[PDB]
Design a protein around this nucleic acid. Structure first.
Length: 70
DNA sequence: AAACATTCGTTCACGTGAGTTCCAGTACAAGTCTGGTC
């Protein structure tokens, strides 16, 4: 029900997965995905899946997000 | 002295133009779904 992974750890795992895909290492990417699954909740894993697919369906335009940021 | 008109004077109903609120329709930007090839 409660996860324990921080944003920095998630970003590091995602970068490791990207390098693994570029490095032709299936075992390492599988291990990273297993760690992500075992150290996250249902909602966290759903959001991770959405981010991986690169389709969040937030409903807020990119320009609105950028304007809010600056 | 009585009747008519006239007049006339009024006032009420109806019609037209300008300001305000609301909503339908249109233009533009972005998200989202989908097509094929190497």
């Amino acid at each position: 029900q409660k996860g324990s992974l921080t944003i920095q750890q998630v970003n590091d795992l995602l970068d490791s997965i990207a390098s693994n895909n570029s490095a032709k290492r299936k075992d390492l990417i599988k291990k990273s995905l297993l760690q992500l699954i075992t150290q996250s909740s249902a909602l966290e894993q759903k959001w991770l899946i959405r981010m991986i697919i690169k389709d969040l369906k937030l409903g807020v335009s990119q320009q609105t997000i950028f304007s809010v940021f600056h």
